[PDB]
Paper text:
Like E1 enzymes, aminoacyl tRNA synthetases (aaRSs) are adenylate-forming enzymes (AFEs). They catalyze the transformation of amino acids into AMP conjugates, and then into aminoacyl-tRNAs, to supply protein synthesis.
X-ray crystallographic studies of plasmodium and human YRSs reveal differential flexibility of a loop over the catalytic site that underpins differential susceptibility to reaction-hijacking by ML901. Similarly, ML901 inhibits tRNATyr acylation to tyrosine in vitro by PfYRS, but not by HsYRS. We were not able to generate a structure of HsYRS in complex with enzyme-generated ML901-Tyr as HsYRS does not catalyze formation of the conjugate. S15F), the 222KMSSS226 loops were not defined in the electron density (Fig. 5Cii; fig. That is, the decreased susceptibility of HsYRS and PfYRSS234C to reaction hijacking by ML901 is associated with mobility of the KMSSS/KMSKS loop, which is, in turn, associated with rotation of the His49/70 side chain. These conformational changes may promote dissociation of the charged tRNA, thereby preventing the hijacking reaction.
Residue numbers in the entry:
A (entry chain A), B (entry chain A): 4 to 222, 228 to 343
Amino acid sequence: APSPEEKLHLITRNLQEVLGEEKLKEILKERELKIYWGTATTGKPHVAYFVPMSKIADFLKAGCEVTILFADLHAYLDNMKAPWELLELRVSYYENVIKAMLESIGVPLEKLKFIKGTDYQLSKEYTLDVYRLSSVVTQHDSKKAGAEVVKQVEHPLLSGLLYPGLQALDEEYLKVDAQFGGIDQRKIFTFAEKYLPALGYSKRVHLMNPMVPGLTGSKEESKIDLLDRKEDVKKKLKKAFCEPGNVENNGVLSFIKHVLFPLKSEFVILRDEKWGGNKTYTAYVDLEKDFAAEVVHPGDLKNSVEVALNKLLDPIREKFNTPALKKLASAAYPD
Amino acid sequence: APSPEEKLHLITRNLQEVLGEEKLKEILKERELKIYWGTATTGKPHVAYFVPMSKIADFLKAGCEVTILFADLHAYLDNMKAPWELLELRVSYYENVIKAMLESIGVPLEKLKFIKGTDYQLSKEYTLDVYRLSSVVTQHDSKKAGAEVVKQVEHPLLSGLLYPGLQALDEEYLKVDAQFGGIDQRKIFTFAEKYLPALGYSKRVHLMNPMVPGLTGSKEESKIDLLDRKEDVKKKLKKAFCEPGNVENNGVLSFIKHVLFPLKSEFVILRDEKWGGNKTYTAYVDLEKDFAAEVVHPGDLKNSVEVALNKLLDPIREKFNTPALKKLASAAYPD
Ligand SMILES: Nc1ncnc2c1c(OC(F)F)nn2[C@@H]1O[C@H](COS(=O)(=O)NC(=O)[C@@H](N)Cc2ccc(O)cc2)[C@@H](O)[C@H]1O
Ligand SMILES: Nc1ncnc2c1c(OC(F)F)nn2[C@@H]1O[C@H](COS(=O)(=O)NC(=O)[C@@H](N)Cc2ccc(O)cc2)[C@@H](O)[C@H]1O
């Protein structure tokens, strides 16, 4: 039975920014927070998705009612990042792999709600609100709201202007108090705080993670897929940006900070007896200090992350080791 | 039983431009043409609406299946020219006054179909097509398609970009072969010819009237309302631009050309015996020649139009002389 103060700590730890602290505290004084996270069903999710999933885990630990939105219409509206025929296959792939990630990090699925955008975003009342919103949002504001999220092409399409407006309306139709996403969503979040009240709807609390550098190319591609075999995880980890003593733009350290510490509350560095043997850290700042002092070597850091990451991936790889899930993976991502 | 050639003449006479003559003739060789005309339910219709209604009459004379669309959602999308609360009152006013105009010029209403946009434009299949269209139409093309139709404001709204796309989709959902409107619709019509095939839908024939100068200020406001009393019709007609011998930008002559000649097939100029007495014209070009020669005086032309216009308005004014229609007129246009 966590106190409102303990819930607030669980909910907001590791975030880059909280908008709406006043209302957030008002809610936690009385009841559970209702929050959602959305993802457009576009490319294959990679290990970076453990970063938002670790905050989802925190939200459930705090007692929140959590909704996960598979934003299939949004994937279509974002420059057809998922063509319309493949959408429902993409939703199935996303649902299976996101549930597998949550099961792997021990998140109880029975208190989560999963919904796909097209379950309600084609309804008459929602569509009427899209038109009501379109009558107050300028073309200027919808273009700028999506600048960091929607793909920016030479001749922008009308769909790209619709995208942020629907993401705002989703807060009302999912009946939430708050929306969580990475800080790349910030301009959509502030757009929603401005325009939802123009429709008679309350502004929501917005919770924003930092954009965490990947476990590969410095801060694009070459990422680690959730279904990569151990040997491919090992190979990709060797090439990760991880300079000795350099605690910035370090995707290996960032994964520890945002995924492994919240999961386990500790992190063990594997190290030879010659250099002091293993050491258990209870706080990220202590590990960071040792890495800056160069008494945690990059190779030992990578070794330690490799062991923990393969533990997270093992049940996922097992789950997708089914004839039906192998066919789904290939069918959702053909050529 | 008019021939295909006689139907084509009735359908296309007095038009400024026909797009799709090849397909138009292919259809008339086999069956009746399916056509619609739409109007956004915004301001009170004035006597200029007799110009499109006279072409509707021609279409029915040619045997066409005609739909009249009361585009209520479009009125809302066009800079809220009709706010959402007043829309259904505006639709009722438009339906009553348009049916009255057609009855006045002797158009049989029983073979016309009347539909309001929100009967189908909020449906799931239509909304899906709006999103499919938005994924191919650029912001650039939708802005330019509506440049002469949608109000151009300093900070354009998203609704204004949606407007031409929905007008294009209306051609498919109303299941027509052709759309009729004034030539101010041309950029929406060519937009529809370009983009409907991107959705797997056929291009439509487009029929365009000329933009006829009003019976008032030269070629805005001061117009004659369909419910104006005889005395107000008389007063407004006195101030109409009608210079002797000047057959251009002459709203009085244009009304004769586009409304009175199609209705009656003749036009009688009322003139004193001293100047030759009355004369009946069987063709507009003969009247124009006499006006250019200054043997039809502006006052006599206005007198002759006044008599005919009050005949067209009399049954409309009688129809709206009901307690329920008086309340409707005031409720749809308050303050
Ligand atoms: N490296 C990282 N570090 C920290 N957070 C990260 C990443 C990362 O990298 C990536 F490559 F995986 N993504 N995320 C976060 O997870 C989510 C990704 O999902 S998304 O598909 O991008 N969704 C969108 O864009 C949203 N508009 C979709 C949407 C649509 C309608 C709604 O009503 C609500 C939402 C967003 O919150 C992202 O910030
Ligand atoms: N002086 C004149 N001479 C000759 N024709 C004239 C005029 C005139 O003057 C005015 F003041 F009355 N209007 N018209 C013509 O009648 C119609 C008016 O209706 S409207 O409300 O303007 N409709 C729109 O704009 C259309 N986008 C509405 C629409 C929406 C969805 C659809 O699927 C189809 C259509 C249009 O065709 C106009 O050209």
